[PDB]
Design a protein around this ligand. Structure first.
Ligand SMILES: Oc1cc(O)c(-c2noc3ccc(NCCN4CCOCC4)cc23)cc1Cl
Length: 213
């Protein structure tokens, strides 16, 4: 006592910050697509660890099952999406969630200006930010082989934090925790989640399981 935790704060690239502002404040009526985008990202992460394991089977020693889990929680108002994909290193987190999306978010924002639909966000490689359609804050917990477990967090205030996660180890993969907006709690309902998964992610090549109490 006490334990000491160092936290690093980073600014988003200007265009990523602009897109996050647009997304978190839009009145877009087809917000359910956020789940499709996150599940698609998880599928890609699972494809990556599968690819590595083609050459080195020991890459799955940290977790043999390749799947996606959905966990709603009405008591803390969160929807969690967990995958056992490749996971991210600290640099992956800092770069892929705060800097590398600048180009894509710019191309997407120009597309929106030209009449494109928000549902096309995934084609620009920045679908992760669609989480802010329904969430006021997002927490990302990730674990990559040969690296420590990290926690990323942002409330779309122009910055994000990264720190070493002291919580329960994940083995390998990524956990996206959506802290839902007060008027978006419908996404915590078992029936609504099933409907959205069937409608937009039925053909995902990894098992998607919905955990309920
Ligand atoms: O929602 C997520 C779920 C994930 O598994 C990962 C993830 N785990 O390991 C990963 C390793 C690399 C990357 N790349 C970030 C850029 N995106 C573009 C769209 O396809 C997915 C990758 C993501 C993840 C990231 C997010 Cl944002």
């Amino acid at each position: 006592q006490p334990m000491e935790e160092e936290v690093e704060t980073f600014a988003f690239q200007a265009e990523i910050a602009q897109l996050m502002s647009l997304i978190i404040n839009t009145f877009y009526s087809n917000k359910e697509i956020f789940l499709r985008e996150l599940i698609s990202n998880s599928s890609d992460a699972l494809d990556k660890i599968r690819y590595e394991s083609l050459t080195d089977p020991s890459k799955l020693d940290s977790g043999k099952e390749l799947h996606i889990n959905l966990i709603p929680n009405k008591q803390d108002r969160t929807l969690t999406i967990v995958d056992t994909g490749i996971g991210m290193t600290k640099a992956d987190l800092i770069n892929n969630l705060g800097t590398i999306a600048k180009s894509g978010t710019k191309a997407f924002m120009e597309a929106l200006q030209a009449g494109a639909d928000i549902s096309m966000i995934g084609q620009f490689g920045v679908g992760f930010y669609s989480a802010y359609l329904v969430a006021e804050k997002v927490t990302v917990i990730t674990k990559h082989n040969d690296d420590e477990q990290y926690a990323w967090e942002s409330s779309a205030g122009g910055s994000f934090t990264v720190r070493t996660d002291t919580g329960e180890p994940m083995g390998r993969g990524t956990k996206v925790i959506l802290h839902l907006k007060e008027d978006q709690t419908e996404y915590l309902e078992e029936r609504r989640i099933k409907e959205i998964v069937k409608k937009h992610s039925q053909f995902i090549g990894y098992p998607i399981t919905l955990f309920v109490e």
